Swiss-Prot record, chain A:
Belongs to the bacterial ribosomal protein bL34 family. Pfam families: Ribosomal_L34. NCBIfam families: rpmH_bact. It comes from the Bacteria. It comes from Escherichia coli O45:K1 (strain S88 / ExPEC). One of its GO terms (biological process) is translation. The gene is rpmH. This is Large ribosomal subunit protein bL34.
Swiss-Prot record, chain B:
The modification N6-acetyllysine is found at K241. It comes from Escherichia coli (strain K12). NCBIfam families: rplB_bact. This is Large ribosomal subunit protein uL2. The gene is rplB. PROSITE patterns: RIBOSOMAL_L2. Part of the 50S ribosomal subunit. Forms a bridge to the 30S subunit in the 70S ribosome, contacting the 16S rRNA. Interacts weakly with S6 in one of the 3.5 A resolved structures. In pull-down experiments interacts with CedA. Residues 27-52, 220-271 are annotated as: Disordered.
Amino acid sequence: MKRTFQPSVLKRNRSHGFRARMATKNGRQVLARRRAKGRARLTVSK
Amino acid sequence: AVVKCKPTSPGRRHVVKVVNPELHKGKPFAPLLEKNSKSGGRNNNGRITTRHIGGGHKQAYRIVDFKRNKDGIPAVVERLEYDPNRSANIALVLYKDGERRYILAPKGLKAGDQIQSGVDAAIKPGNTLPMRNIPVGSTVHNVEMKPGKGGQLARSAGTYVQIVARDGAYVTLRLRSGEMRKVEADCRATLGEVGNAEHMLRVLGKAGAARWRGVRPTVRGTAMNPVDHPHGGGEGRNFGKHPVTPWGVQTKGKKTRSNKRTDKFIVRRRS
RNA sequence: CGCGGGGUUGAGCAGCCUGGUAGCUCGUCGGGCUCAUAACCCGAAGAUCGUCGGUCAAAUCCGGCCCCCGCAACCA
RNA sequence: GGGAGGGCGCUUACCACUUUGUGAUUCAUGACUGGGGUGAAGUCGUAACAAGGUAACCGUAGGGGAACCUGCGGUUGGAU
RNA sequence: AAUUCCUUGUCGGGUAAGUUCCGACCUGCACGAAUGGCGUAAUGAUGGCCAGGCUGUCUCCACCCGAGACUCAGUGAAAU
RNA sequence: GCUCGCCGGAAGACCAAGGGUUCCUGUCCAACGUUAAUCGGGGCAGGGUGAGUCGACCCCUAAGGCGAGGCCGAAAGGCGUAGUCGAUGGGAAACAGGUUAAUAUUCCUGUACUUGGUGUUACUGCGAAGGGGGGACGGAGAAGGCUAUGUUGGCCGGGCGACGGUUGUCCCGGUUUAAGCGUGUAGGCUGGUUUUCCAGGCAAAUCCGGAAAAUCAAGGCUGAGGCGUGAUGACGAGGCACUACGGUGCUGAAGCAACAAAUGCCCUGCUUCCAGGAAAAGCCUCUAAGCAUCAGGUAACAUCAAAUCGUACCCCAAACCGACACAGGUGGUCAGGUAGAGAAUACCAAGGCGCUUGAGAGAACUCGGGUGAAGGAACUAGGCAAAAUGGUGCCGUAACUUCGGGAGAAGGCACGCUGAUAUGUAGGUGAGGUCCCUCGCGGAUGGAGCUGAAAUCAGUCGAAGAUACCAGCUGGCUGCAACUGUUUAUUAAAAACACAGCACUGUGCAAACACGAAAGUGGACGUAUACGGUGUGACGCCUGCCCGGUGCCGGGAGGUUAAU
RNA sequence: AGGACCGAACCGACUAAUGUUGAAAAAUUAGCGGAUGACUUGUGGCUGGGGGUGAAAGGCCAAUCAAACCGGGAGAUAGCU
RNA sequence: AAAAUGACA
Ligand SMILES: [Mg+2]
Ligand SMILES: [Mg+2]
Ligand SMILES: [Mg+2]
Ligand SMILES: [Mg+2]
Ligand SMILES: [Mg+2]
Ligand SMILES: [Mg+2]
Ligand SMILES: [Mg+2]
Ligand SMILES: [Mg+2]
Ligand SMILES: [Mg+2]
Ligand SMILES: [Mg+2]
Ligand SMILES: [Mg+2]
Ligand SMILES: [Mg+2]
Ligand SMILES: [Mg+2]
Ligand SMILES: [Mg+2]
Ligand SMILES: [Mg+2]
Ligand SMILES: [Mg+2]
Ligand SMILES: [Mg+2]
Ligand SMILES: [Mg+2]
Ligand SMILES: [Mg+2]
Ligand SMILES: [Mg+2]
Ligand SMILES: [Mg+2]
Ligand SMILES: [Mg+2]
Ligand SMILES: [Mg+2]
Ligand SMILES: [Mg+2]
Ligand SMILES: [Mg+2]
Ligand SMILES: [Mg+2]
Ligand SMILES: [Mg+2]
Ligand SMILES: [Mg+2]
Ligand SMILES: [Mg+2]
Ligand SMILES: [Mg+2]
Ligand SMILES: [Mg+2]
Ligand SMILES: [Mg+2]
Ligand SMILES: [Mg+2]
Ligand SMILES: [Mg+2]
Ligand SMILES: [Mg+2]
Ligand SMILES: [Mg+2]
Ligand SMILES: [Mg+2]
Ligand SMILES: [Mg+2]
Ligand SMILES: [Mg+2]
Ligand SMILES: [Mg+2]
Ligand SMILES: [Mg+2]
Ligand SMILES: [Mg+2]
Ligand SMILES: [Mg+2]
Ligand SMILES: [Mg+2]
Ligand SMILES: [Mg+2]
């Protein structure tokens, strides 16, 4: 059975990447929540 | 000619092909080709706005000259060609100065014939000259709406337009739909009647014969569910409703025209 | 065996619609035209309202009864 | 001493009886059904024979309980 | 009848025996003409019935070969 | 170490995606390993990835994203022009061998090639954002020439048999060599050269386009393979010795022909068909402004530079997605022998594994299989399941029909081995000879060797010769749906949905309709033979009566009637 | 030539059996349908919740769908256990 | 304008 996670680095950084967060007003507030909470690694960008 | 395929397969029984040997069987003229990308019915927002569109075969748009703005300068018809973007074969046209274009094909055009446009051109099938110079009671095609716009009326396969009367600065036309219009007497109108008239006499034969044309299947509203289509519902083929488009508007009778700005150009509504 | 609609001169159909008031078409009878029968014309007769019971009065208002025509008897 | 040759036995070839599988044709028989014929004062009508009371008929098409009726063309084997 | 309650309607075929099946009757509770009618060769992992071959499906089970099930050594769950 | 067994279109070998030390040594068995463990993809420590040519980077674009100004929108914001990003596509160059415990088209040896800067010369009109050319494109089918590759023969090296034979038509092994450079074949496309003129290629143009005239029957482009050369080199069985006994060092013969042959190459080719089959850059050419000293361009010569990042390892799995060392999922590339039409199946080679609990016993009962007396659907909701047929050639084959079908209908016959026809035929292949020759990678003639079906006759063995795996069950009547297709991922695959066809109706282009507070966009770079909605569902014969009710269309007199 | 025929790769899922605290949160075994097309597959894009998409089953939208997931209104309300 | 029918011997 073909599972629901077929990983792909290029599609992960194009969608949940940092520069994906910065390009939209709603995404920019997503980071400001993570920084305020005090998260170690913010988005996904390994 | 219309040729009926022999029933060697259940799905080739009812195939009638309109085949024209005279169509050139090489490659189209290279400098007149551009890229043509499908949409599948999707627009800016990415949602479908016209249904049953998608798939098909990759095609290339050919730059058909609709305006026909070359006064003087006779030309010859080099060859006839098959245009997938339309219903009427096109013709490659070579002018005396060495310029090549594409034009639509009147029914009485072969390879090697000679045409020319302008207000002084002769009255023969293929020439373009303003409807002011065109004699009344004639049968024309590729008609315009505004002087120099390019031409919209009577462009499909086998259709034409009758010129009924010439009143002052306006000319009255009877269209192929039965409606009567008035257009400004300075519109150009290529003289003739569009070719490939056997385009009715064809039956695609099978489902794939339409699927490979950019036509996706349509699903009747009586099969849908009540939340998808107004007809919907029913335990065993019940209707009980006045026929309606999926958006609630009435079909099957309801007039839905409103311009109020070009109504001054209509003589008799189609009937 | 719960709920409707109905029983009218020989046939079909009104009058029951707020209680005095019985009609229409066909049909039966007696004459008339015809050689004669149909057809047509002129005249007549025929029901007390399904039954048994309950106000000055009853086809009508009410109940039982007899018969007919209908609908509804479902969830497991 | 045996040899040549022959018979018996075995074996192959041809073929009768017989057994299969599919057809063709012919003869009876079959619930029900189509038309036809005959029969007694039956029922509904009156199509045709006269100008048969809408002249008849031929081909074709549609309709009707039935004779039949109507459209289109054709003939005189129609009266005045 | 994918439609017919009474109904296993009645007659015929098939079977020793046929509420199913095929043909016919019409008494259509409650078929019927593009929410289409009646036919139709080919097609179908579609619904119903019949026949030939075939067989442990069955009368009625018997034997045999392998993995388990049982004993010894190691590790060692779960529902309640 | 010796046997046995299994996969062998894979359970073998190599990649992209993905993972991130899992790779190699030494060392340890507390924990992880469904058991023990000296073992491990475990703990600890050390080691390991070498690039002008392979990729990424880089130049160019598709779908599409972002979008200076801008248009639009209560604010956020939406769309979009010039531009600029985006490969799953286009653009320069390296091959053979040797070596490490671990890397190698990356190091070493040998032999190459590509693009830039600079310098020396010899020539020279150079010059772009613009003109043109090319890059540049589909599906099917058919042969023809080849190669990889395999079989056989020769040659070389070795051998004379554990038990009857085996100095011979006997047995085993080897018979390999690249990129590059020259040559230009089988073939495939196109006529070339020159001269004069021109309303077109937004300006110009000697280039494309077009119009004329002469001339010659030739020229040019493309092109797999073959043959030289690289290579009197490397490789090479096996012998010689050290053996730390893991392997290491020395030497080294033959290294040729025939036949068969691809799904790979010529082939982006040829023929044919309708459903008519990406864009831009690299590259060639023409000129404008501009420079005519220069500058710049063409060719040879010498030198310099080619930076940065990946390079271990698993990659159909114990290292990826499934919570696990999980009977699941995962795109591409290579394709040996025998029998076979085959990438099916059966047995094998190269290679890799025996699937991380065993040892006993031989009860019931369950799971997976084998055979069965006589009967053959009597069981059952129902022939569910088992059983059965199963190949090639030939004979033969009905009702019905849209003339194609039905049909592989049904039902039958032959099939192994040896010999003769023929000391292997028909056919395919084709060496020396021989002649001609535009003399070459030629053309005829020429049949040595090689390979090789199919058939007939006769004999022969078994119970059985498509002997194994592989491999149709067949007829009769009937409802529904014309047919191939699609559907409830995970209880419903159908009579449901779709379909080609038919009908009604809307729609005159700034179209109807749809997404959207709007701008705008799909419809469509389409124009009534077109497009949208609705119903029916191939084909044949058909589609009767009702406009009272509910809608819809037309009407414009009369009545009723809102804001003002 | 064929939405032509038989049949492996490939795609699918008609029947029976086992499994139902499985090897597997839908598979294995023996059979089965399509296999030049309305086919199948790799990479990258687009459409977003009363919205998408749908050869139409209320199917599918991260093991969830007659209206997803996460946070907030929120200690909603509960004549009910 | 309407205008039908009449066993057999
Ligand atoms: Mg349609
Ligand atoms: Mg439905
Ligand atoms: Mg609704
Ligand atoms: Mg119904
Ligand atoms: Mg008469
Ligand atoms: Mg008459
Ligand atoms: Mg019977
Ligand atoms: Mg134990
Ligand atoms: Mg094996
Ligand atoms: Mg580690
Ligand atoms: Mg342990
Ligand atoms: Mg380790
Ligand atoms: Mg770029
Ligand atoms: Mg934008
Ligand atoms: Mg801006
Ligand atoms: Mg790429
Ligand atoms: Mg070879
Ligand atoms: Mg390695
Ligand atoms: Mg696994
Ligand atoms: Mg294991
Ligand atoms: Mg796969
Ligand atoms: Mg195999
Ligand atoms: Mg046992
Ligand atoms: Mg058995
Ligand atoms: Mg037995
Ligand atoms: Mg027996
Ligand atoms: Mg038997
Ligand atoms: Mg029984
Ligand atoms: Mg029985
Ligand atoms: Mg079975
Ligand atoms: Mg079997
Ligand atoms: Mg039935
Ligand atoms: Mg079907
Ligand atoms: Mg199907
Ligand atoms: Mg399902
Ligand atoms: Mg299913
Ligand atoms: Mg339908
Ligand atoms: Mg139908
Ligand atoms: Mg009708
Ligand atoms: Mg097929
Ligand atoms: Mg097949
Ligand atoms: Mg599926
Ligand atoms: Mg789900
Ligand atoms: Mg809700
Ligand atoms: Mg609150």
